[PDB]
């Protein structure tokens, strides 16, 4: 309804600093100059190349639910110069699941730069070594099982499952939320089955719009899963809570309504 406009007006001034993203040495690491991570929730990268003045920065935020397994990483789509940083982040957080919300190119515009090798292929990104051992295809998404490890350190290999959503329309949101719900159920089955699994990374393009919709839907669906129908589902409050860790999560009115539609579809399915 009209509450989304109230939240948008609430975000006309941000209450936490974004200084690290505004440094000169980071100007080439952001897709947009107005989409920057908060300093107090940004992901700090270790083991960068000392030849670069700043190597601890990535346009990424840790997102925690609050009234690593149950937390997320919301970040932008990779740039050509930030792919190694993305893989350093995925390794450093012990992340095991990645959710791509857009295609590589949609309507001519490059949304997510390809950062993985093809099936049965292997590629090194900086000090990280990534092997694509299997690719499966469903109706709504493509699953890729990757093996991530540090070069010269074979005892660090772990499996990262990349779920690439491909059905999202070019304009608007999906007319039915069943695909998103089944996709998130698969992602939840994968993440729950891995012990000591890091945050689920959710990314593409700007990393606030579809990323925010996905993260908020997952949080509310997990609440319903944990306590049933006798619980409070406050969509504006959840959007406010996730916005205190990354600016502008969920951007359009269609996505705002899609969150409600998906939550009620999940409730009626139980």
């Amino acid at each position: 309804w009209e509450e989304f406009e109230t939240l948008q007006q609430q975000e006309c001034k941000l209450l936490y600093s974004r200084k690290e993203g505004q440094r000169q040495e980071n100007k080439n690491k952001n897709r947009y100059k107005n989409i920057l991570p908060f300093d107090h929730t940004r992901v700090v990268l270790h083991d960068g190349d000392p030849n670069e003045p700043v190597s601890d920065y990535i346009n990424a935020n840790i997102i925690m639910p609050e009234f690593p397994k149950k937390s997320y990483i919301a970040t932008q789509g990779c740039l050509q110069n930030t792919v190694n940083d993305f893989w350093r982040m995925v390794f450093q957080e012990n992340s095991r699941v990645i959710v791509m919300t857009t295609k590589e190119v949609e309507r001519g515009k490059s949304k997510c730069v390809k950062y993985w090798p093809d099936e049965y292929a292997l590629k090194e990104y900086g000090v990280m070594r990534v092997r694509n051992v299997k690719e499966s295809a469903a109706h709504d998404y493509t699953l890729r099982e990757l093996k991530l490890s540090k070069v010269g350190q074979g005892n660090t290999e772990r499996t990262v499952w990349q779920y690439h959503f491909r059905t999202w329309p070019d304009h608007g949101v999906p007319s039915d939320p069943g695909g998103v719900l089944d996709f998130l159920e698969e992602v939840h089955h994968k993440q729950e089955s891995i012990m000591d699994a890091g945050p689920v990374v959710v990314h593409c393009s700007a990393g606030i719009g579809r990323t925010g919709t996905f993260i908020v839907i997952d949080i509310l669906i997990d609440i319903i899963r944990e306590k049933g129908v006798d619980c409070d589902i406050d969509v504006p409050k959840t959007i406010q809570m996730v916005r205190s860790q990354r600016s502008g999560m969920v951007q359009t009115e269609a996505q705002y309504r899609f969150i409600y539609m998906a939550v009620q579809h999940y409730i009626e399915t139980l």
């Binding site: 007006q9 001034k13 947009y32 107005n34 989409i35 304009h171």
Partner: protein
């Protein structure tokens, strides 16, 4: 801190006595999820994707104002024109 005006220009390029073809510039590297166009007699509102830089308004016998979302880090007030 830096602050930018989004959009920077607002131009009436073509017109019929009941329609109006409005256009605006787009700040490069600036994320805009959508635009909100408000029009009234010197109101009515509609929205438009961030991809677009042009719009058409019909049903007129006028102040036009363009908002860009997200709203933070902007000059403090939207761009507007009279026709």
């Amino acid at each position: 801190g830096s602050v930018s005006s989004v959009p920077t220009k607002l131009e009436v390029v073509a017109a019929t006595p009941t329609s109006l073809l409005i256009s605006w510039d787009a700040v490069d590297e600036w994320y805009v999820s959508y635009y909100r166009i408000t029009y009234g007699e010197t109101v009515q509102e509609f929205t438009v994707p961030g991809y677009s830089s042009t719009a058409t308004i019909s049903g007129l016998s006028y102040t036009i104002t363009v908002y860009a979302y997200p709203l933070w880090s902007q000059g403090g007030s939207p761009i507007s024109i009279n026709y």
